[PDB]
Design a protein around this motif. Structure first.
Motif, short mmCIF file in Angstrom:
data_model
loop_
_atom_site.label_atom_id
_atom_site.label_comp_id
_atom_site.label_asym_id
_atom_site.label_seq_id
_atom_site.Cartn_x
_atom_site.Cartn_y
_atom_site.Cartn_z
N UNK D 172 5.04 7.80 9.37
CA UNK D 172 6.02 6.74 9.47
C UNK D 172 5.65 5.60 8.56
N UNK D 173 4.37 5.28 8.55
CA UNK D 173 3.84 4.21 7.75
C UNK D 173 4.02 4.48 6.27
N UNK D 174 3.92 5.76 5.88
CA UNK D 174 4.17 6.15 4.50
C UNK D 174 5.51 5.60 4.04
N UNK D 175 6.54 5.92 4.81
CA UNK D 175 7.89 5.52 4.48
C UNK D 175 8.10 4.03 4.61
N UNK D 203 -8.21 1.00 6.63
CA UNK D 203 -9.25 1.89 6.13
C UNK D 203 -9.39 3.17 6.97
N UNK D 204 -8.82 3.19 8.18
CA UNK D 204 -8.88 4.36 9.04
C UNK D 204 -7.65 5.27 8.86
N UNK D 208 -3.68 9.46 1.80
CA UNK D 208 -2.42 9.25 1.11
C UNK D 208 -1.63 8.08 1.68
N UNK D 209 -1.92 7.68 2.90
CA UNK D 209 -1.25 6.54 3.48
C UNK D 209 -1.84 5.31 2.87
N UNK D 210 -3.16 5.30 2.76
CA UNK D 210 -3.83 4.17 2.16
C UNK D 210 -3.43 4.03 0.71
#
Lengths: 587, 151, 8, 296, 418
Positions: D172-175, D203-204, D208-210
């Motif tokens: 979800x965070x990706x988008x 950092x956790x 790919x999200x980071x």
């Protein structure tokens, strides 16, 4: 009961329940309990079963109680019929019966009878038989969970029970304390002395519970021992628990270990690791937990496991998760005085049938290589030899580790890259594929005659590559462009065009970023003039730190660090007081 | 029509095995094992009308089943059969067993299986339903019993 | 059952 | 009548036959829509699945949202991870069929999608994330809305980050990040937005999200840098640069090669930015140019 | 502590359902099933599994999973030891914790669980008290029960429950006064390819069967107690006297009883009674190879090595084997690639071996290592540590009971590299 309709059979059971024959009643109840054990819905029999709650046949009585426990919460109105039986039972001269009645009564989850249960508890504390009092402690806990608002009274009851010299009661009472009012330390201060002295006389399960409680308060009454003199009370706590360490109950042992780990002076506590090792001689389920605790400890006090190093060797029969934990422990215990042994053992471990383990082993070798710089050349050599291994996972994993080694030591290892360039043809795993490309890019000035060939090979495969790989293709291309656009700009443009239409917008974002940055344009200003500084910036070495460093705030031995999650109900430990609180409160 | 009728407990142990379509002995055993995993792993709240197995010749066929206690009754039938009609037939077959064994139980499947087969033969012939009249099937069963007792 | 044990 | 019976065997068969009718005369089948919704309350999932198929066939612009509200009601009370994954998938397929043919209110849709992100434990969070991006990108008209909701999702990342599984909740965070970065002009508190993105907890997150975060973060920085340099708040810009100085050194230690890669090149950019701003250079123009290259 | 308990067979089926605090949905078991599916082996299933609202603590044992449900923070070993103890109790009452034993004694085990766990907290925990609270299912007793209507549930709290010796019953007498001691040692050893000892230690444990009338005070002492270290003690032992006298003074519990366990210090070289000669040839991509293993005596102390079993887990390249044993029995499982050789016992006149060829998968490459060897064995009348008991004395009673003790050493974690 027979091969027929369940409904009809239940009606027959009702007949048995109504029947005057005790054996009929027993048969029915056994069948009913069987249904309860099977998760069957016997609730429709409730009004028929409850009628036998007053039966004189003790065997039946027990069966009835089971039934009531299972369904009383639902059939709350019908359950009311059983109340007087319990009330009368509570007045019976036979304390076994009284206790049984007390238990069953308290287990009835009906809000209507709360006043009743409350009164029963108060009387139970006054029972004078320690057996009943033990049960009373559980009743307190039960009522609390059913009606939190009575807490104040329940506290008063606990306060009373805490004064009981009997060791058959205190255990449960302490448990009740934690369940109802874990913060009311003022109720215990006076009782600390006997809790310590009598701990060894408490039944093993109580001992576990008590110790956990003891550590939690100890961190408020005492100040870290690690000139500091030891408070006689502090000393009392520790010297009394000492003998418990040799207990047959692993949980007890762990509880003792916990105490010393969080309370005992660091120069003294070392002894518990000896016992922690013997815990590894028990059932595997225990060992799993124990190893987690060992690892947690080893990240700070390596010397406590040091002399037992060989005991952590991994056996081929161990479950992967066990193999993993042991590996981590060995990792933390590695040092220059034993690394040569460990490396030989690790070398063997790499060849294990358990490829998951072997992969982890490879990672471990990399980790210890960063820990001991003195052996990294040989670590690398062995690791490089693994690249020739026919297994895809093995090689791919070693590639990644080599990458990390090169980040740590960016020396002239172009020959490795050259080898990697050839390996790339066979590498399937995207991560490794990307990693190889990255290394090529990082040292493309050291292998400038190879890189452009790799480039066009990748350019053709680009659309079939992993997005991670594609990103490396972009970064690689950017570097190749900036340093050699005269030979690579065409391919660069093609790659940019590929990124341009790729559905993964992250790639496109990186693509437009790079394009704007490296490709000369209308606004090619100062920052674009630093693109070569940006892409050729020297990167810092990675920190391969152990995961237990993140469990320092969890109390050792609790569920929460075994999960690495602040689990429901978990209480956090207090920090050591600047000064100790007025000692006389404990007098 | 009916390809096979199997009866087995919750451990896969057989209580009755009668095939109508030719299979090798090993195939038959394997079909039973397949069926066991396909049926005994189904919950009590699962539709009794299952797809066919593969060892029987194809999933187009159906496994119609009914069970109680620790016993499973599976009717392997082809794609043209009425799953609903079959289930009805399964129950009345059981009713016949009760009529003939004065309430059939596992011990009759265990020690009187020869007669269970005789009954079954009167119910189904060659995979085709031989009788649907429950009183008539009992009548003929007893007629044979009388013949046996007579001479 | 006594057989096999060392007298002690 | 067969459907109304208690025998699940024939109930299923009735629904199967109902499908056969639906396929040619759905205009009559729609009358039993409520019944079909009720069928979801049974225990036999093949019935419940069949009902979902029937609902798919019965959905139109005149009952989509209503059915969805009931579908949601069901998945909310529903238990079973794989069952829920299926329910989710079906809800998505039902509402997305033919490019969201029956959705006119995408504001509504997204808020529904947001409620779908609350389905803890789902293995198709990336599916949801894809839907998030698809609509936010396609439906320009409500991008401001989407931004505000995704910024809320980004604040909720401290809970969403409880599950960093592949294709799970963290997707979800990706988008959310991608949208908030690209449509940062619809932020009311871009400073706060950055601060949320700068939280240590990041950092956790999955590599790919980071990676997404640092790319969007520098875009967000480009926006706030332009904001302050446009405003003339040079010292404000110095504080912004200082934030970059004090945050990138954390990320460069990420285990994810590409996160530390991007972070490293970002920090190098930051070094040049600090020098150029010290020299009174309005670098935000050049910086923003690095993101302005693509709108879709 | 514990909210509920599910007994699950390795098949994935639920057989025994319990609830103490509230009714927990059976759907919680899906999280275990998922984990079970993810794991490649039941042994590798995580003992601690977190779900959205419940924590799952479980024990794998004897093809059964003991899955408890806990909604709050409880020390993992507290729970593990408890559940483990429950399984031990089942072994006490029904010979072993098996699903068959459970389904055949549902009511009884259901009742046992109700006595042992009270609202999630330990209640009946001590064997001998529990044995009186609920009589073991002796068929003779069940006959009496059908005749007289007698219960299996007592109505009097066992006096020992309120005594200062809670681990045992009161008023128990025997006409055959006797006590048996069993010193069991296990050799934990890691042997490398060369046959060199990598690691070794001795794990000992002393059990006993007490059939002594009344309340005898036993006093156990050793001829060489200096060899004992890191000794565990059952709570019944007067630890203080162990420390000041080096004497195990205690009044023991009735029947089957584990007294102590101990370790033999690594300072003394652990004798290895068995050596292994071995050779396995794997030509890469070959249709076959060679297998040769010989088992023989080494430091057997002049005693017979018997009950010898060799188990080997072969790599996927192995399809079958052409081996001929010199004794005992050769068998091989091509499904799981398991080689099992029943060796039997060693006679010095000819040492046992297993040899022949290996049927390999043509086109498949040779393994990077040979599988380690798991070898079992037993030597009777021998405590490999050399531990010897000095005296066994009894106080408080007047009879002169049969006193007997055995010494035996068995394979512990004995594994050989190759």
């Amino acid at each position: 009961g027979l091969f027929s309709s369940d409904l009809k059979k239940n009606e027959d059971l009702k007949q048995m329940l109504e029947s005057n024959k005790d054996s009929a009643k027993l048969d029915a109840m056994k069948r009913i309990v069987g249904m309860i054990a099977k998760g069957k819905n016997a609730s429709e029999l409730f009004p028929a079963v409850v009628k036998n709650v007053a039966s004189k046949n003790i065997e039946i009585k027990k069966l009835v109680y089971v039934y009531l426990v299972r369904y009383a919460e639902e059939q709350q109105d019908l359950a009311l019929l059983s109340i007087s039986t319990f009330q009368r039972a509570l007045k019976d001269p036979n304390q076994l019966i009284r206790a049984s009645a007390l238990r069953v009564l308290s287990s009835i989850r009906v809000p209507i009878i709360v006043p009743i249960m409350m009164l029963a508890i108060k009387e139970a504390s006054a029972d004078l038989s320690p057996y009943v009092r033990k049960n009373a402690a559980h009743a307190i806990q039960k009522l609390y969970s059913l009606d939190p608002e009575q807490k104040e009274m329940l506290i008063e009851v606990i306060e009373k029970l805490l004064k009981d010299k009997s060791t058959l009661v205190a255990g449960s009472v302490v448990m009740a304390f934690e369940e109802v009012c874990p913060d009311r330390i003022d109720l215990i201060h006076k009782n600390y002395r006997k809790l310590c002295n009598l701990l060894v006389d408490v039944e093993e399960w109580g001992q576990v519970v008590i110790i956990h409680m003891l550590t939690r308060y100890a961190r408020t009454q005492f100040v870290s021992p690690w000139p500091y003199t030891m408070d006689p009370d502090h000393r009392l706590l520790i010297r009394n628990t000492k003998p418990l360490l040799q207990s047959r109950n692993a949980a007890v042992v762990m509880a003792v270990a916990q105490l010393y780990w969080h309370i005992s002076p660091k120069s003294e506590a070392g002894i518990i690791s000896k016992s922690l090792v013997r815990l590894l001689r028990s059932n595997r389920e225990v060992q799993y937990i124990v190893l987690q605790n060992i690892a947690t400890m080893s990240i700070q006090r390596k010397g406590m496991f040091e002399p037992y190093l060989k005991s952590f060797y991994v056996r081929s029969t161990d479950p992967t998760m066990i193999k993993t934990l042991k590996l981590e422990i060995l990792t933390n215990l590695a040092n220059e005085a034993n690394i040569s042994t460990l490396l030989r053992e690790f070398q063997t471990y790499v060849k294990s049938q358990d490829k998951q383990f072997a992969a982890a082993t490879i990672q471990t070798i990399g980790r210890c290589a960063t820990n001991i710089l003195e052996v990294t050349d040989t670590c690398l050599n062995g690791l490089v030899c693994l690249l020739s291994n026919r297994d895809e996972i093995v090689v791919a994993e070693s590639v990644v580790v080599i990458k990390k080694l090169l980040q740590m030591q960016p020396a002239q290892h172009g020959e490795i890259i050259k080898h990697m360039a050839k390996l790339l043809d066979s590498i399937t795993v995207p991560v490794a594929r990307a990693s190889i490309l990255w290394l090529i890019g990082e040292n493309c000035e050291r292998v400038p005659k190879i890189a452009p060939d790799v480039l066009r090979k990748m350019a053709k495969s680009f659309t079939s590559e992993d997005d991670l790989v594609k990103l490396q293709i972009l970064n690689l291309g950017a570097k190749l462009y900036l340093t050699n656009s005269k030979q690579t700009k065409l391919l660069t443009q093609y790659i940019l065009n590929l990124g341009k239409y790729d559905q993964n917008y992250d790639i496109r974002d990186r693509t437009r970023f790079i394009r704007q940055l490296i490709v000369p344009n209308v606004k090619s200003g100062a920052l674009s003039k630093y693109a070569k500084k940006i892409f050729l910036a020297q990167k810092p070495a990675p920190l391969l730190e152990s995961p237990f460093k993140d469990r320092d705030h969890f109390q050792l031995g609790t569920l929460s660090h075994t999960l690495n999650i602040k689990a429901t109900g978990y209480l956090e430990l207090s920090n050591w007081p600047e000064v100790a609180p007025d000692p006389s409160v404990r007098n | 029509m009916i390809k096979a009728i199997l009866i087995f407990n919750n451990h896969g142990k057989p209580r009755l095995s009668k095939f109508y379509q030719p299979y090798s002995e090993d195939t038959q055993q394997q079909i039973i094992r397949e069926t066991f995993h396909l049926v005994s792993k189904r919950d009590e709240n699962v539709c009794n009308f299952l797809e066919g197995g593969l060892l029987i010749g194809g999933s187009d066929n159906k496994l119609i089943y009914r069970h109680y206690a620790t016993l499973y009754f599976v009717f392997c039938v082809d794609s043209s059969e009425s799953e609903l009609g079959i289930l009805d037939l399964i129950q009345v077959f059981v009713e016949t067993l009760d009529k003939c064994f004065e309430n059939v139980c596992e011990l009759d499947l265990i020690f009187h299986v020869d007669k269970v087969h005789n009954i079954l033969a009167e119910m189904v012939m060659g995979g085709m339903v031989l009788e649907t009249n429950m009183n008539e099937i009992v009548t003929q069963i007893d007629a044979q019993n009388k013949l046996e007792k007579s001479e | 059952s006594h057989a096999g044990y060392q007298t002690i | 009548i067969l459907i109304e019976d208690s025998d699940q065997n024939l109930k299923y068969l009735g629904l199967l036959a109902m499908s056969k009718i639906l396929k040619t005369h759905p205009k009559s089948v729609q009358s039993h829509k409520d019944l079909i919704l009720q069928c979801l309350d049974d225990k036999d999932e093949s019935i419940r699945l069949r009902a979902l198929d029937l609902l798919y066939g019965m959905v139109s612009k005149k009952n989509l949202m209503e059915i969805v509200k009931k579908l949601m009601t069901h998945v909310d009370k529903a238990e079973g991870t794989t069952y829920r994954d299926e329910l989710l998938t079906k809800i998505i397929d039902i509402c997305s069929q033919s490019n969201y043919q029956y959705i006119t209110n995408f504001e509504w849709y997204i808020s529904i999608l947001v409620e779908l992100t609350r389905l803890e434990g789902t293995r198709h969070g990336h599916l949801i994330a894809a839907q998030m991006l698809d609509v936010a990108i396609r439906v320009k008209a409500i991008r401001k809305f989407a931004v505000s909701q995704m910024s809320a999702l980004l604040d909720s990342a401290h809970l969403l980050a409880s599950s960093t599984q592949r294709n799970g909740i963290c997707e979800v965070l990706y988008a959310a990040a991608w949208i908030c970065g690209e449509f940062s002009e619809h932020l009311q508190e871009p400073h706060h937005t950055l601060e949320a993105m700068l939280r240590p907890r990041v950092t956790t997150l999955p590599g790919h999200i980071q990676a997404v975060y640092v790319q969007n973060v520098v875009k967000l920085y480009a926006s706030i840098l332009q904001q302050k340099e446009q405003a003339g708040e040079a010292e404000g810009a110095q504080a912004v640069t200082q934030l970059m100085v004090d945050r990138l050194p954390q990320f460069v230690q990420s285990a994810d090669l590409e996160v530390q890669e991007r972070a490293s090149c970002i920090l190098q950019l930051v070094k040049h930015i600090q020098k150029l701003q010290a020299k009174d250079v309005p670098v935000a123009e050049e910086v923003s140019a690095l993101f302005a290259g693509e709108l879709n | 502590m514990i909210h509920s308990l599910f007994l699950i067979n390795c098949s994935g089926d639920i057989f025994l359902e319990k609830h103490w605090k509230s009714v927990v949905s059976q759907s919680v078991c899906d999280y275990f099933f998922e984990a079970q599916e993810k794991a490649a082996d039941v042994e590798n299933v995580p003992p601690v599994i977190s779900t959205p609202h419940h924590y799952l603590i479980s024990i794998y044992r004897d093809k059964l999973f003991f899955v408890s449900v806990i909604q709050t923070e409880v020390p993992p070993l507290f729970v593990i030891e408890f559940l483990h103890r429950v399984a031990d109790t089942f072994q006490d009452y029904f010979g072993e914790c098996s699903e068959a034993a459970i389904k055949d004694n549902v009511v009884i085990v259901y009742e046992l669980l109700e006595e042992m766990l009270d609202n999630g907290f330990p209640l009946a925990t001590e064997s001998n008290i529990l044995k009186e609270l609920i009589k073991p299912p002796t068929i003779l007793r069940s006959v009496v029960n059908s005749i007289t209507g007698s219960s299996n549930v007592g109505d009097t709290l066992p006096t020992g429950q309120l005594s200062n010796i809670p681990w045992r019953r009161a008023g128990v007498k025997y006409t055959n006064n006797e006590a048996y001691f069993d010193v069991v040692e296990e050799i934990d050893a890691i042997i490398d390819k060369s046959g060199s000892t990598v690691f070794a230690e001795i794990q000992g444990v002393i059990d006993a069967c007490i059939k002594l009338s009344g309340m005898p005070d036993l006093s156990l002492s050793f001829m060489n107690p200096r060899l004992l270290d890191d000794v565990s003690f059952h709570p019944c032992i007067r630890f203080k006297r162990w420390e000041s006298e080096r004497v195990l003074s205690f009044i023991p519990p009735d029947g089957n009883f584990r007294l102590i366990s101990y370790r033999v210090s690594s300072q003394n070289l652990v004798a290895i009674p068995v050596y292994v000669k071995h050779s396995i040839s794997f030509k890469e991509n070959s249709s076959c190879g060679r297998f040769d293993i010989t088992i023989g005596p080494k430091q057997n102390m002049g005693k017979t090595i018997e009950g010898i079993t060799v188990t080997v887990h072969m790599p996927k390249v192995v399809l079958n084997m052409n081996l001929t044993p010199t004794q005992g029995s050769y068998t091989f499982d091509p499904v799981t690639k398991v080689l099992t050789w029943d060796v039997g016992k060693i006679t010095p006149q000819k040492l046992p071996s297993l040899k022949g060829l290996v049927n390999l998968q043509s086109g498949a490459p040779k393994p990077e290592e040979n599988p380690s060897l798991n070898i079992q064995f037993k030597i009777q009348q021998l405590a490999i540590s050399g531990l010897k008991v000095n005296r066994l004395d009894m106080y408080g009673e007047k009879y002169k009971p049969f006193k007997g003790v055995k010494y035996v050493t068995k394979a512990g974690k004995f594994q050989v590299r190759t």
